[PDB]
Paper text:
ANTAR domains are a class of antiterminator that bind and stabilize dual hexaloop RNA motifs within the nascent RNA chain to prevent terminator loop formation. EutV possesses one of the most common domains architectures found among all ANTAR proteins annotated in the Pfam database, consisting of an N-terminal phosphor-sensitive REC domain (aa 1–119) coupled to a C-terminal ANTAR domain (aa 141–186) via a coiled-coil domain. Ethanolamine (EA) stimulates the histidine kinase EutW (component 1) to phosphorylate EutV (component 2) which promotes homodimerization of the protein. Dimeric EutV acts as an antiterminator of RNAP by binding these dual hexaloop motifs within the nascent mRNA chain inhibiting T-loop formation and thereby preventing transcription termination.
Within the crystal, EutV showed a symmetric dimer ‘dumbbell’ conformation with 48 residues contributing to 1870 A2 of buried surface area and extensive hydrophobic and ionic interactions between residues Ser85 and Glu161 of each chain. The REC domain of each chain dimerized through a common ‘α4-β5-α5’ mode forming one end of the dumbbell with the ANTAR domains forming the other end. The handle of the dumbbell consists of a coiled-coil that includes residues Leu128, Ile132, Leu135 and Leu139 and forms the majority of hydrophobic interactions within a heptad repeat. The interaction between the two ANTAR domains is stabilized by mutual hydrogen bonds between Arg142 to Glu146 (2.9 and 3.0 Å), and the amine group of chain a Glu161 to Glu160 chain b (3.1 Å). The dimeric state within the crystal structure was unexpected given the recombinant EutV used for crystallography was not phosphorylated nor supplemented with phosphomimetics. SEC-MALS analysis performed in this work indicated EutV was largely monomeric in solution although may form higher order species, likely a dimer at increased concentrations. In this way, during crystallization and with an increased concentration of EutV, the dimeric state was likely preferentially favoured. The dimeric RNA-free structure of EutV resembles the crystal structure of the ANTAR domain protein AmiR from P. aeruginosa. Within the EutV structure, the conserved active site residues in the N-terminal REC domain are in a ‘phospho-activated’ state, as indicated by their position relative to the to the BeF3– activated CheY/CheZ complex and the BeF3– activated EutV bound RNA structure. This positioning indicates that the dimeric structure of EutV observed in the crystal is representative of the biologically active phosphorylated dimer required for efficient antitermination.
Numbering used by the authors:
A (entry chain B), B (entry chain A): 0 to 189
Write the structure that this text describes.
Amino acid sequence: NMDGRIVIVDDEPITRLDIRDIVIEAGYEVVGEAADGFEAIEVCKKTQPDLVLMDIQMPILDGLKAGKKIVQDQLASSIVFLSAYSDVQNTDKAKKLGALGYLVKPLDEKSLIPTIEMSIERGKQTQLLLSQIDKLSLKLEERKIIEKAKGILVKENHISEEEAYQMLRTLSMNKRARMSEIAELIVMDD
Amino acid sequence: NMDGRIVIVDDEPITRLDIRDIVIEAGYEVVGEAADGFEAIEVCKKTQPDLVLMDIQMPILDGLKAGKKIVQDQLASSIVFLSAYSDVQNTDKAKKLGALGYLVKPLDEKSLIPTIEMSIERGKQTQLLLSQIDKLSLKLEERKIIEKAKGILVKENHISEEEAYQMLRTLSMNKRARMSEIAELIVMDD
Ligand SMILES: [Mg+2]
Ligand SMILES: [Mg+2]
Ligand code: NA
Ligand code: NA
Ligand code: NA
Ligand code: NA
Ligand code: NA
Ligand code: NA
Ligand code: NA
Ligand code: NA
Ligand code: NA
Ligand code: NA
Ligand code: NA
């Protein structure tokens, strides 16, 4: 039926069991549970879920701080908040840390399953886009630093740009360091 | 008092009015309204809203097709669906086309304002990511096509890489063309 790996985070045990029953009847896999933010971070690090269902308010460590950590280290693909609190200050924190949904307790159960589906898909889309950005940024910066190092090597040695690139390559091969690290060493403080 | 520009799309005038009253009381600007998918596409193209609230079940053209069009041509920053139906086929289509929220009628009003805040924030974030990807890709492709053109000129002319680049520069400036446009002509599926 519905596919996804879910972690449930709430300090009230019966509320966790009610949510658990709902998502298991939908066919999601509940890969872990937690009662405070420290447990939430721990469980998400181990399980690496598609989604965290979390109350913003919990003992010891609140859900917003736990969520900030979970997004920051990408321990789950998406976070959806479930809380009795819905003031603008709490929702501004939840949206700025990165949450994909926020339903207010008592839960409208019919909305929960659609919200989970949307949040899982959007979270994995976002992870893909951030990976694209990382790769593209790396390739562009490596081209830039290699170009700058080539210019420096030409000016210092009086070689051609082709010979400078072959210097960077042969150094990279023989050392077993990337040409961008070689180039950074050539460029430093210039 | 919230901030955001919203289009409300529902075939029922009373439901449009109920939602309008809620979001206006919250402080959002309703920039347009529609009763079918063709109207919704047109309104979004004129208004370019931060969010469109859309029913799936509509005559003439349904919400999923209109939403797919709105995402494809970036006519709104986010879509949230509002349907009496919550089945897996409708939710699969909504998530794949790229919706950020799906909520199920009759509306749990207390969730609506939080879901709007999340969806607007996530939509603006995603547009930033997509913009960064396009900028990085264009810069990288310009570098790549110039590199390819330089190597072609070197091999045909038997000039140095430096002289090849100055050829591309001189052509670009004399023709008042982008150097990538010149390089595209030099490469011409070589
Ligand atoms: Mg609590
Ligand atoms: Mg309808
Ligand atoms: Na289970
Ligand atoms: Na993750
Ligand atoms: Na904040
Ligand atoms: Na997304
Ligand atoms: Na990421
Ligand atoms: Na150079
Ligand atoms: Na409704
Ligand atoms: Na953002
Ligand atoms: Na592009
Ligand atoms: Na050059
Ligand atoms: Na340009």
